[model samples]
Target: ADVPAGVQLADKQTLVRNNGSEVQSLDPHKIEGVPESNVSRDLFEGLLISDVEGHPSPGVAEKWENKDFKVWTFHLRENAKWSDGTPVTAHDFVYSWQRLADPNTASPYASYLQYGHIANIDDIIAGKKPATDLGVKALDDHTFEVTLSEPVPYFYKLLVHPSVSPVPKSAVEKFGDKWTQPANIVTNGAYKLKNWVVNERIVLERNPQYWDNAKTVINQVTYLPISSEVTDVNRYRSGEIDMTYNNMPIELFQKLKKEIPNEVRVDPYLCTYYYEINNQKAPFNDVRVRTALKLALDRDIIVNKVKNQGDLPAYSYTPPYTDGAKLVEPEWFKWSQQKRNEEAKKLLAEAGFTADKPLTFDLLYNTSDLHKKLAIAVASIWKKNLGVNVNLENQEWKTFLDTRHQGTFDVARAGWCADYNEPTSFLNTMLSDSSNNTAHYKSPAFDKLIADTLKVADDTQRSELYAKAEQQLDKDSAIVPVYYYVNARLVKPWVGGYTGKDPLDNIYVKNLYIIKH
Candidate 1:
């Protein structure tokens, strides 16, 4: 196996990484894909960041204080500068946060601020008020103030989301939607965008003006978007890549763990892999049809037999280990396989489908050997159990995202990795108004429950309300919870400071160096 040109490096500190799919957007405020998130984190610095342990730590803002939990003040680092050598200021954050909440920004993640305690954020997103009416303000060039609508204990943890990262107004206003292109970009993180070739790779150069540039040793990082698990594994095995981040197949990871244990790392992540049913479309528009499809799936079989890794069969949308949340599986999740199959057939029949006249819909998934296999396995189960005919359609990552966002698919594979480890992080995305609601599932009851949960300060009460909201989603079969993910991939022995944990996983390249051994 010869080393590929992308990984041939004379400098030990230069790292080559592999990503599972192409990045959808480099703009922090507009991105919804995880691959794009990697680019955003490397190019921009948020007020706070997640540490290796998934806890909030200082990034652009050195420290912050809260007098009553409703009002918080952040002290920014005076030395932090953008890639273009402009000082990073509180006004940048004020502008960025406002842009994210501004109704015109049309960011899918704008709901994050509404649920995460930004005062008057609801009004700002509703267009009844201006972005300036939102709570965040610049107290001074280096000081920022954020007023919350209510006391939020976990609000600090959410500061790491890229949507809150400061963007240079000069660059954005000058370039508009093209501001994220490498030529027009201005960044303040430890690395800056050097080049981006769509569907091929993204090259990042170390930011000389980074506030902590002295300790940032990595000279450059290359993220290759390798869609095929086989191609990614071959590259890594042939020494064409230093690390594969969530790009390789789970089955391959298991095979390698026994063969080359030192190279493999698996860590628990707060995420759920599920299928989004288009509620606005027929067949799925009926709750009974949705329930039938969900009931036909045997997740245990998929996780234990097909995945063959540490993935847990998902029973709820939220992971069981979220802070203050109790594990609650739906009664249908515990039903015997025979019972589930019986119920699924009944639901299909009730929805005006017969064994001869079957319900048909397309099951869309991104291109990957593992995802294809998973889709095939589930499609087989649906056909066998409920006599439903599912046409499987596979598209490239970017196309798939666009199709899902456009609501052009009957059902699509989707996964949500926790931006912050909270129930709201998962539940709020299902809201009627949430742009991330790919399923198009709408329930005023569910929305009210989420809004009520945000107003309460008691953890237990909030957890209970979150549970109710989750149950509503499950009951409607808005999404079919398949499994909880575990990060399993390979890191070269010479690479240091990457653990592949959630939140801090792709963004921790700033801490990575190299060893000669």
Candidate 2:
């Protein structure tokens, strides 16, 4: 049975800006924006999905088989359909893959094709010949064949992610760059986006023609991007809103929990909120300086007084849930301040800061109450623990990110929720020197671990490599370990049947029913 479409989102004022001007080409194949991805999920789908437990579930493809060392064939669900009433065929998959690998596309996410499933994407990105010369091909209207450089255990899970979803070529050719905008993006999944007003609100409606149309519970939904935790909570209290996030003040959350604990929900999200020291810039250019600053962080204080959510103190990048995933194994989790504080103190002393000599640096955060509180708390912690002074530098989101994307600040606060449920999705994507590692901390061993692990066949072997890479990242203090994120939101009782999610915060409105009897 087809599930009916559902509309849901992170809410207004909390919503991030869409850099893609008109949001054309939501072909998930070429797009990377968060909101855009959310919108496109209805327009396109990949080969797999994630369950409530953060495990891979099936998507477009029901299942797949490995025919040889590098050759893989995937069987698509015959039930999938395009909004236009055409069977979403193998041709659609082929065209989408080819378009992404096209020499002209220049998508950073094209790396997904080469690394996760199809081989030779790196060479294609490096300006090699057409990807047609590489590996993936469609055998029929509902079959997909892919060839890889090596076996990737997490590859199927990777396929179900947004990085590999298929989009119709007809839509791409019709709208050109504007394919993802409000009027052009077509639906394939449970919901389709209706309207978006950036920091205001974005709306979605159920796709009556979706494959699983019967399961969709909601008819229409709106996302209000509210950043203020207090305002969000108050709105829900007034019965005007459904959910609010970004962490409320500890006292406020405690009060809410005391009064309506179920309404004030908390989930341990697969993310890390941490501090990055720009290794490219001066002062922080010294490794010792970075270590000294990190050593001064009073993690215990921040979690207790600022982030009231039940967030685990993070000592490394691979967050709590990620440590036990397929591409990751359960090993000794290190980087606990208890085990390294002495070494950190010694490093601080060696870096010339002592009881008498004080070193000071700037601390930056997004201009929000949550961050401001966290920053202030972090500043106080540093001052008390290490006798190091931290001058606060809080800026509005856009301006702050502009400076950050350009590698501008000395030390800055940043957070990432995984787009998918893989440890490599966090470690190999964010911390890798090649991606968004604007911090400029690079190690050959780290890079090698990523490169080697991608080509390995064993999940345990790959997980170990990822661990080593993270170990190096932690040892270098590439980013200060703050806390593994636990999501805190005030959910109005009116909203029911809504399930929680990991890093992406994908709320399926199709499953949510408004109980108004």
Candidate 3:
């Protein structure tokens, strides 16, 4: 609980870092991507923000407890205030949670509360009940209560996601769509929006109204929406910025590791980069075709040779660090590459595809030199191994996300970071009712296992259920798992408190300081 000493602080205590792509929306309810997540973390504090180790800790809530593990209560800090000097009450949370589940908001992550087992959430989202009928109540000015359908062990983890943060109800209703603009937004976190120039930089300054503002060290943090990794690293090397995104060209990575190794950081991040296949469409609708395409992937080459970063070849859909997760790897990983390729061809042949009538599909990804390399490499592997025709396509971030969500692609590139450090965080995306289910994959058995996971009280039983759930996805070949991500970045030596300990990579400028250099 020690605060940084600001007496000897640098003349300009500011941090400039590279955050990939312009954020889609500043409205917490509308945010879906990591770039927006990074900015939102600074502007909004959830009930339980992640600690240095990525475990849920106190934020807006000073303390919380569960009653029979079905009903939960939270004691919000009395001193917590929005930047506009308004008291941040428990009512804000109730409003925000209801608004999140409101169908009118059209949030892709609306399934969040439904998956959290919040009572009445399913009925609310399905329009069988009203949003105000959600299972939440503001007990008083500083007390909040949540009623759950069952004992959800990962409920605390879900609270760390920024989407669960409270928004000012009055301001939102007053400004309508302009509620998120810098002039109107009022945040309860360590920083508040100061300036936002589209496709340029988002500058956040310390919020004096924050409950723990005295401990805050960084006066300013600027997030540059730079899309190109090469330019991002160049900006870092030239000292225009203090950090880089999770990507760097492999040749530059090697050069930097040998030359300026101290600045390079590659840490365990709870994320899985994969390709989402549209199971609702032609050709890919066949389970044999899906399984064949999955088995044909050379993840070792993708991770070791192509990425060259310290990324681990992914064997399961969920990352390894998830709580109560027993990895359910497909049996294909144990064999030689030749045997795997042979099996892939055999599966395609069984699906009635021949060398003369080869299968063809489009591989789609967002525009990036980094992603382009992976797509090209993967397409070549498919062609060389199965003699299939593959078309590579790229789109901007927003368009690509829409295309994937609309299920308009044959196979699209995708990556999922832990919304919280739990297997359900990743697995829920494949649920039949999930709005974020890119592939529109539907499996009653998988959905049942996920639901039964919460009903079980024992950790061993929960772990077993999680394993079974993953096995269902594997059986269906729901999605292709590529490589587990490492949070590889460049942090300048002068920047202090770059604690990249959290597998979720939840960065907070409150923990950082700028010493007199």
**Per-candidate clash tally:** 0, 31, 0
Indicate whether candidate 1 or candidate 2 has the larger TM-score.
1
Per-residue lDDT over 1-517 for candidate 2, one digit per residue giving the tens place of the 0 to 100 score: 2222553332321112112122323557555544445555545677766553446677778888875546778888998887767787777778778777776875546656655647776676567776676577889878988888776655665665565777777878998877767788766777776886766666777777777777766666666656566666677677666656445654477788889987766766777888978777876767777776666676666776567568876667777577444423212234555544565567778877777777777888865667777888888777666677888997755566567767878889877667667777777654343434546676777778778876666777777777777777766777777888876767665566545655556544555565442
Candidate that would win on lDDT: 3
Error in Å for residue 12 of model 3: 0.8
Candidate 3 to truth, TM: 0.97
Instruction: Let me know the TM-score candidate 1 reaches against the reference structure.
Output: 0.95
List model 1 lDDT by residue over 1-517, tens digit each. Answer: 1223344333667888887888878888888777878777778889997775667899898999986788889999999899999899999999999999998998877887876778998788889999989898999999999999888877888898888888899999999989878899899988988888987889999999998888777888999998888788779889988887674575576778788898887888778888889998886789998888788888888889878778899878888776656756889888897899999889888888986787888999999988888999988888888788889999998889879878999999888887888877888788888867777888999999988885777888888898888888888888888998877778888876665655335456787777665
* Residue pairs with backbone atoms closer than 3 Å in model 3 (clashes): none
lDDT tens digits, residues 308-425, model 3?
A: 8888887678887676678766678777778878988999999999978889999999877788889999999989887778899988777788898888899998899988877889
Off by over 4 Å in 2: 1-43, 52-54, 98-108, 114-117, 131-134, 249-251, 323-362, 384-403, 430-433, 454-460, 499-506
Using lDDT as the yardstick, the better of models 2 and 3 is: 3
Which stretches of model 1 miss by more than 4 angstroms?
1-11, 500-506
Q: Provide TM-scores for the models.
A: 0.95, 0.83, 0.97
Which candidate, 1 or 2, would have the higher lDDT against the true structure? 1
Between prediction 2 and prediction 3, the one with superior TM-score is 3
